[PDB]
């Protein structure tokens, strides 16, 4: 078990430290609750619980959570909800140009990544791809990578208008394109149970669904606008057991083949014992041989220089993540980490500060009526994850708003409260048992904006 | 009672003929139902009902509506729903460049009108303003003229991108602007009961709400984009009793004063006995005196030539509608026509083919969860309008889709069925009594596209 020459050691250590700290903050709540349940409800109950909470979780608890526990029993569910919300707040607060130039040199003025809403793909940008979130990098996760065409088209139009009017990334005459990346996931160890649940854990079904959505988006962009407007499409598959990516190389015209791809597992295997420059040569030629391969991978021409450079950089970055997983877990995630191990249900736009693998179940929705199935899937997952142990389900309803648009924050807060009430009236049996805990938050759309808590009522 | 020299007589006759035909098609159903209720449920019930329907409504009825009526009683509610749907279909089927040049000469490359969702404002474009619906004219009605800023901003961005890329209306360097018109309504005879129900029938409240929304949209456009991007705003008030408009004249910088306006009632009064050219001179100077007036109407500078020409054309067009109302109803709508007299509830994008005053109650919504209050208001209105007489409430769920975007039609049909089910589960008491009848339809976003019925399940 040696180290790859291209591994980013200090970045790996930093990422591991952040992951460990956040997961520990979320996980230490349960032992504290178990200790609390053994404290008699005497006259010293409140003081003892408060000092124990200060010693364990680093914060105290509101007296309303403990004031009437002597007559109403231990308020373990309320303490759990409060502690989970505090852990999420602490994680976000603790988290809180070169990428644009690199994208421009590769021939793109904007990169749009649409991975699956699976929790195992949450850390796709900071861990698997090592791509920072910039003003021109977007991450819109959907269930089964089934991203919506209309909003992507609107984003494309907005970016093109910005290029035409101000040329913020670059002037409109530059021959750069809009890059849309679709990410599917699969499990090598358990293909039939640990795959994409949106497609019945069928690897090829997820692959073809993502490819079809990419093709539909490209054709919609072509149809909606004239003068030969077009976009570039990229397809990436992630093995959730080893966090290794296979990138489907487009041909000269940009079409993607489900069989023409570069797999980073064999690349890591065959570049382990070489030297940095030689490994870079290896991946540079390997992209070419994969793109020029025949048979089922028959492709017309070869991909552009920018495409190949971008894919090579992606593979080099993913090598560090493969090495990170090998170091931390001996080459494969533990059996508990292979499946669902989420700590809370994220509803709305999600958090850009806690992009950690298998931390939360994300349900991209603006209305419960439109995407109820995501909420039901999350509740079903947490029924086994949490309700089996008797713990309540924590739900963070987070939304982003644009401060430039007048009245946007109030509308966003109203939307958050509406979502909270809709999730309340559904699963009303779980509500009556206090098995659902909520926290509502809003944030400005700018990167690094503070997160503001809002009252549930 | 003489005729205004500027009245468009043949256009008035044509409009009156269409209004009469559509309203008669909708209204003749009830007498037919009353005749049907007197037919004994013998062996000749089906044949007699079918021949009566052919003689009266011009179409037959499905046998399933009448096959089991002998044991289940008269199916008057089902026949009512079917006949109302057929009447709407007949009206739409019967309904089924110069404007762009006129807009360009006035300095606008796109006109966006956002009237109140009141049924009395339904015929605002073809009757009150005489403005045809073109590829660059949009009509987005909202309750209380409370139009949404985000979609308007998206439409502005799309239009500007089209100008920059292809210059379909005109090239981007042309000094034209995007024109946004907000229309509020008021009642002269019954100000406190027949005003804007979204603002408690308060005229000044509706005026200031519309003005505030226009100002918010202008400031949002200014903030979201640099290089001094801006839009033009116009405010119009409509007296639903006489269909007369007062247009608030902007000053040199485009700001609007709630007190600086030209009223078309006094204009019609003072131009009745003059000649066409003299009347045109009168309205041309009247715009100037109103815009230069002082006191509460103090404004900085005078409006541009294009603005004044557009407002003058609007007033000249509205003169014909004032004359039309004077001819048909003796100067004021009948007391039954002053209030609510709608025939069905339109849910979704509405119909561009039946723009007739007080024909339908429109509820602009994509989700019942988001805009439930519109549905409740419509149900409350039709409880007095229809449920008092024992008739069911007819609801047309209509939506528009873009054929260019792949999979758009299927998504739209799914959305229509979802809306239908959501309205079904709400007001379930009305559903169980068969007091809600539905028809679901989709249409391509292009003007003049056919309307396609879809099954409720
Ligand atoms: Zn998935
Ligand atoms: Zn109104």
Numbering used by the authors:
A (entry chain A), B (entry chain A): 48 to 143, 154 to 514
Original authors' sentences:
To determine the structure of HnCsoSCA, we expressed HnCsoSCA fused with a N-terminal Twin-Strep tag and the B1 domain of Streptococcal Protein G (GB1) using Escherichia coli BL21(DE3). We then resolved the structure of HnCsoSCA at 2.51 Å resolution using single-particle cryo-EM. The overall oligomeric state of HnCsoSCA is a homohexamer, with D3 symmetry formed from a trimer-of-dimers, resembling the CyCsoSCA homolog. The monomer of HnCsoSCA showed good map densities for residues 48 to 514 of the native sequence with a short unresolved loop between residues 143 and 154 in the region connecting the N-terminal and catalytic domains. The catalytic domain of each monomer contains an α/β fold that is structurally characteristic of β-CAs, such as β-carboxysomal CcaA. The Zn2+ molecule is coordinated by Cys173, His242, and Cys253 in the catalytic domain of each monomer, resulting in six zinc ions in the hexamer. Closer structural analysis, and interface analysis using the PDBePISA tool, revealed that the dimerization interface of HnCsoSCA is primarily stabilized by nonpolar contacts, burying ~3,000 Å2 of surface area. The higher-order oligomerization into trimers-of-dimers is formed by interactions between the terminal domains of the monomers to produce two equivalent trimerization interfaces related by the D3 symmetry of the oligomer. These trimerization interfaces are primarily hydrophobic in nature and are smaller than the dimerization interface at ~800 Å2. While this motif is present in our HnCsoSCA structure and forms part of the hexameric interface, HnCsoSCA has Pro87 instead of His155, precluding metal ion coordination.
